[PDB]
Ligand binder design. Structure first.
Ligand SMILES: Cc1nc(=O)[nH]c(C(=O)O)c1C
Length: 160
């Protein structure tokens, strides 16, 4: 039975069948999650550019990297940013389904340098849930903060 789990570690060391990159729309290597991803799976950045609110899979060997582009909330209104964030997660769900994978490693999109300086843990996690609730894959959420791990864990626990 599929589950949601949270791990506080480098997503580049995930034990899932595919990874989601928190990507930029230019398909460029970048910093944070995206940098680690680039180091681990650099061939996945071939033609990886995709618009904000979309996701595009590029294979690294047979390992799928799903580049998902959350909005930078510095640029977007709260209303349009929210719509874009929901959309990116929805595209991730589609790619996960098309690939036939049993599990996916996912970061919370638009919660770091794209957060517009705002705490968006709940906003981002809820969009992730909405999208992935229609899939049969085990989901492992990767974060880096000690707290966020607790709050994500609590949020998972309370739906069961
Ligand atoms: C490049 C990038 N894309 C995202 O979807 N989210 C984030 C984020 O704020 O984590 C970044 C930095």
């Amino acid at each position: 039975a599929p589950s949601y789990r949270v791990k506080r570690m480098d997503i580049a060391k995930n034990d899932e069948e595919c990874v989601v990159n928190a990507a930029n729309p230019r398909g460029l290597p970048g910093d944070g999650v995206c940098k680690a991803v680039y180091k681990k799976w650099p061939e996945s950045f071939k033609n990886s550019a995709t618009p904000v609110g979309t996701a595009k899979t590029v294979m690294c060997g047979t390992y799928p990297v799903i580049h998902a582009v959350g909005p930078n909330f510095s640029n977007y209104s709260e209303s349009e940013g929210d719509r874009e964030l929901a959309a990116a997660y929805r595209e991730v769900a589609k790619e996960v389904t098309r690939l036939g994978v049993n599990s996916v490693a996912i970061p919370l999109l638009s919660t770091g340098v794209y957060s517009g300086g705002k705490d968006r843990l709940t906003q981002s996690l809820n969009h992730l849930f909405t999208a992935m609730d229609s899939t049969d894959a085990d989901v492992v959420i990767y974060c880096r903060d000690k707290e966020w791990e607790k709050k994500i864990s609590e949020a998972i626990q309370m739906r069961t």
